[PDB]
Curated annotation (Swiss-Prot):
Annotated stretches, region: Loop II: 24-41
GO cellular component terms attached to this protein's record: extracellular region
Span of the entire protein shown here: 22 to 83 of 83
UniProt keywords, alphabetically: Acetylcholine receptor inhibiting toxin, Disulfide bond, Ion channel impairing toxin, Neurotoxin, Postsynaptic neurotoxin, Secreted, Signal, Toxin
Classification lineage: Eukaryota, Metazoa, Chordata, Craniata, Vertebrata
Protein name from the UniProt record: Erabutoxin b
Amino acid sequence: RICFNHQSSQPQTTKTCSPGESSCYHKQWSDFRGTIIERGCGCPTVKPGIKLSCCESEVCNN
């Protein structure tokens, strides 16, 4: 499987999900900079208001 590991707009770099991690996660939410988009494997925790779309499909978090 695979999961993007960058932020905002930049030469997207891919990281092969590590053991245990079998899903990708996309954390998107606007802040004081504009549009912040975190991404990677291992659906982390978030705060009420931020969106986290997890998908058990390779490359699913831009």
